[PDB]
Amino acid sequence: KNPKSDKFKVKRFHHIEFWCGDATNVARRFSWGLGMRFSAKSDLSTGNMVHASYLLTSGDLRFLFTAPYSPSLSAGEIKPTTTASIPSFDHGSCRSFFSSHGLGVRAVAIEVEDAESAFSISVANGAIPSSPPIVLNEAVTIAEVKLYGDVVLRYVSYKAEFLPGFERVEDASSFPLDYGIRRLDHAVGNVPELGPALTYVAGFTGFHQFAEFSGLNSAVLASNDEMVLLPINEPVHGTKRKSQIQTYLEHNEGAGLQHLALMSEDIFRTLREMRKRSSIGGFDFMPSPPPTYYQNLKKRVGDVLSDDQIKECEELGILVDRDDQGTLLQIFTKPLGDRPTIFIEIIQRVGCMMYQSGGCGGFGKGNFSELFKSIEEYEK
Amino acid sequence: KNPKSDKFKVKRFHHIEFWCGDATNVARRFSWGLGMRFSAKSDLSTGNMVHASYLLTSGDLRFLFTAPYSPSLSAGEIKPTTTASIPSFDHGSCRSFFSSHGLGVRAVAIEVEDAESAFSISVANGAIPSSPPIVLNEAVTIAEVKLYGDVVLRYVSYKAEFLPGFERVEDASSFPLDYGIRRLDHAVGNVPELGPALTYVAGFTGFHQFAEFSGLNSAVLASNDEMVLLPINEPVHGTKRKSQIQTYLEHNEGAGLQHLALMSEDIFRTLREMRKRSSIGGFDFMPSPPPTYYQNLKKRVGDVLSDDQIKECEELGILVDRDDQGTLLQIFTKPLGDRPTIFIEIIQRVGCMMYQSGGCGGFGKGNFSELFKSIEEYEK
Ligand SMILES: Cc1cc(-n2c(=O)c3cc(Cl)c(C(=O)C4=C(O)CCCC4=O)cc3n(C)c2=O)n(C)n1
Numbered sequence: 061k062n063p064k065s066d067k068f069k070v071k072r073f074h075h076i077e078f079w080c081g082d083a084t085n086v087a088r089r090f091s092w093g094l095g096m097r098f099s100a101k102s103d104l105s106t107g108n109m110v111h112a113s114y115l116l117t118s119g120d121l122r123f124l125f126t127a128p129y130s131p132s133l134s135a136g137e138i139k140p141t142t143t144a145s146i147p148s149f150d151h152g153s154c155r156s157f158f159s160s161h162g163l164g165v166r167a168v169a170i171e172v173e174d175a176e177s178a179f180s181i182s183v184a185n186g187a188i189p190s191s192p193p194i195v196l197n198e199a200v201t202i203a204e205v206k207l208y209g210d211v212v213l214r215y216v217s218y219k220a221e222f223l224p225g226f227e228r229v230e231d232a233s234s235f236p237l238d239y240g241i242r243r244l245d246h247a248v249g250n251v252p253e254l255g256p257a258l259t260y261v262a263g264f265t266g267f268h269q270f271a272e273f274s275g276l277n278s279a280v281l282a283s284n285d286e287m288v289l290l291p292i293n294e295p296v297h298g299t300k301r302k303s304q305i306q307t308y309l310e311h312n313e314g315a316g317l318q319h320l321a322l323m324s325e326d327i328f329r330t331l332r333e334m335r336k337r338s339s340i341g342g343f344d345f346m347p348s349p350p351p352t353y354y355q356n357l358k359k360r361v362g363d364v365l366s367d368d369q370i371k372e373c374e375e376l377g378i379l380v381d382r383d384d385q386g387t388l389l390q391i392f393t394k395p396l397g398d399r400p401t402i403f404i405e406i407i408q409r410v411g412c413m414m415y416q417s418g419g420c421g422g423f424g425k426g427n428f429s430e431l432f433k434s435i436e437e438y439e440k
Numbered sequence: 441k442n443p444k445s446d447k448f449k450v451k452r453f454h455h456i457e458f459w460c461g462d463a464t465n466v467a468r469r470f471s472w473g474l475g476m477r478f479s480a481k482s483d484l485s486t487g488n489m490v491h492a493s494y495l496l497t498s499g500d501l502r503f504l505f506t507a508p509y510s511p512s513l514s515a516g517e518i519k520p521t522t523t524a525s526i527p528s529f530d531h532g533s534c535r536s537f538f539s540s541h542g543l544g545v546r547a548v549a550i551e552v553e554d555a556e557s558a559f560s561i562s563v564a565n566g567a568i569p570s571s572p573p574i575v576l577n578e579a580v581t582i583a584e585v586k587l588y589g590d591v592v593l594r595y596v597s598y599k600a601e602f603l604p605g606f607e608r609v610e611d612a613s614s615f616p617l618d619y620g621i622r623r624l625d626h627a628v629g630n631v632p633e634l635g636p637a638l639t640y641v642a643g644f645t646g647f648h649q650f651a652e653f654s655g656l657n658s659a660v661l662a663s664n665d666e667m668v669l670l671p672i673n674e675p676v677h678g679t680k681r682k683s684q685i686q687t688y689l690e691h692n693e694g695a696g697l698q699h700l701a702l703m704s705e706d707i708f709r710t711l712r713e714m715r716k717r718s719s720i721g722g723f724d725f726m727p728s729p730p731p732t733y734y735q736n737l738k739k740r741v742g743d744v745l746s747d748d749q750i751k752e753c754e755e756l757g758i759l760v761d762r763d764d765q766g767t768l769l770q771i772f773t774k775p776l777g778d779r780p781t782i783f784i785e786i787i788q789r790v791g792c793m794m795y796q797s798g799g800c801g802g803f804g805k806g807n808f809s810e811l812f813k814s815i816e817e818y819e820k
Pocket residue numbers: 246248274278279280291292293319321379390405423424425427428431
């Protein structure tokens with residue numbers, strides 16, 4: 061069921077912002093590992109004395125990487141005279157975030173019709189304000205409320221290219237890498253307690269629970285057209301294997317964003333390209349599932365993928381799950397940084413065509429039991 | 441003249457340690473951009489609950505990248521019970537260093553006969569102690585004294601592979617990249633005042649002044665065989681163009697390491713390989729000198745390089761300088777991180793064969809006047 065209860069008009073995911081200590085090195089690593097192009101910048105070369113911010117793009121996906129400069133560069137400025145292109149930025153907040161959590165997502169940004177109204181209605185419905193609405197160059201309005209931990213939900217609205225104060229990057233420095241990644245599919249948070257977190261977020265957004273079909277319980281909030289998907293996990297304590305959610309919470313120093321799922325238009329091409337670069341600066345992937353796994357997929361998705369393609373999943377280590385209206389191809393990276401916290405999922409969805417409706421195939425929770433049983437069968 | 445006044449036996453540069461906020465992303469970027477292999481690690485997977493440290497190697501060059509974990513992971517430990525593989529490490533020092541300077545070199549490490557004796561003699565001769573000698577696994581001794589700013593000189597001695605507590609990296613994760621870089625040639629510091637800095641360092645090491653042949657005055661300290669070379673710069677104020685040393689000091693929040701010079705066995709191959717990767721995750725280089733420059737090199741080094749090779753310097757943007765016993769090929773990267781502070785030099789030296797003696801060709805200070813005059817001639 062979809063009651064369409066959004067308390068304000070939401071459009072799509074807009075960008076994800078990482079808070080870093082050195083934006084350059086993280087952005088260059090991500091660009092090479094994921095096949096994203098350098099498209100915009102705001103830094104010393106553009107007059108920004110406060111923070112260095114670099115934008116990577118692939119299809120509709122926008123990754124922003126931001127780090128603070130020395131506060132001494134901007135000590136004469138006041139908020140009305142700031143050279144920061146993102147007015148919510150604060151040196152102390154950013155250094156406290158990175159020293160506390162290490163590399164991670166600070167903002168999940170969604171585009172809305174009216175960011176000032178979204179902020180007002182959100183806070184009137186229980187949202188804890190983070191940064192009030194500010195209008196940038198009479199063109200864009202941005203506002204921020206708390207989502208979970210030190211992660212914020214950022215509203216962006218345009219009257220009528222990223223943000224004012226950002227410059228398009230030189231053609232020479234902008235190499236057109238592309239491994240087929242096209243858009244953000246969902247962004248997932250880990251919290252100690254699921255109930256209060258859902259009640260809080262669903263309370264100020266009006267997002268509804270998206271129904272689906274080990275180590276965690278979770279629930280998915282979705283916007284009216286179910287294109288903005290915000291799952292949340294909590295641990296389950298007292299099992300044989302320690303919950304990966306609890307491990308996250310300890311190493312992250314509390315709640316925060318667990319994974320980003322990026323939609324590919326050709327998950328085979330994406331994973332061939334990413335795996336080619338794993339040991340030369342890119343991303344490592346989860347251990348591949350036992351042979352027994354792929355020996356059972358024919359009996360479960362043999363109607364959607366040919367024998368050639370299931371052996372292509374074989375090589376790349378892709379997992380496949382199936383709901384009632386669609387099928388889901390998915391694979392997970394190892395953690396993106398030093399700590400066992402944030403990672404990335406690559407996905408492709410098959411079915412549910414009207415365009416494709418959101419969440420087609422679910423989030424792969426059937427692969428929990430399938431992988432467990434398959435580990436046992438390979439042992440035998 | 442070389443008085444050979446070293447107060448203790450010094451061998452060679454051993455490693456350079458960068459203090460980072462995320463060691464993984466910096467190390468992966470550097471490995472791809474410079475062609476260095478992942479050879480050793482100390483982190484959660486090796487039992488280190490304190491810091492993540494990754495070692496890159498190319499020839500004899502060793503780059504170490506270290507970042508702190510959450511202090512909560514090791515809150516029960518005391519120094520006698522520590523799981524840190526580098527006992528000098530301190531969470532607060534590391535976070536204070538990175539928030540103050542951003543990405544930069546924390547330690548310049550040289551191998552000595554006896555690190556405990558080097559420390560004692562150094563401090564008896566004015567060195568400010570940083571970390572007393574500690575013997576690791578009855579096998580290696582390390583000790584640290586202050587060099588300039590928050591950079592330390594690290595003594596390492598072996599009784600008889602990097603350090604105890606580090607593990608060799610898996611063959612699958614260790615891809616054998618190599619662009620021809622072979623060893624560290626010199627490591628250069630920027631200070632506000634040259635006199636007191638030289639007096640301090642020469643005072644506790646016995647290093648002597650290595651003689652050579654705009655915006656700075658500098659001086660080079662050298663060990664007995666002149667294989668450990670430690671230049672130091674200060675600004676010259678009151679010129680037309682603002683001194684790059686003063687710019688460094690402002691953006692770095694004071695003194696620190698300015699550049700690392702890496703010797704290549706084939707600087708043409710190194711720069712073809714590095715420039716191929718500049719826009720796909722590697723390093724950018726200085727703007728190439730005007731055409732008039734290469735139109736004058738035949739008249740100055742035409743005896744050492746052929747017309748084919750001088751036009752090969754043409755393409756790659758290599759500079760060439762010449763002293764009285766040797767010739768120097770050199771080129772500079774853009775800054776390695778967000779701030780206009782640390783950069784890298786690639787060099788190759790020609791001449792002075794007995795093996796090659798150190799400093800053969802100097803440090804390129806003749807290229808200052810040559811580039812100025814060449815900019816004028818291209819304007820004409
Ligand atoms: C190996 C191996 C591998 C897995 N494993 C996982 O850990 C695993 C962890 C996560 Cl966070 C997700 C996931 O994407 C998801 C959402 O986006 C929303 C609701 C919560 C949720 O689960 C899927 C996983 N899948 C499919 C999987 O197969 N297991 C259990 N063992």
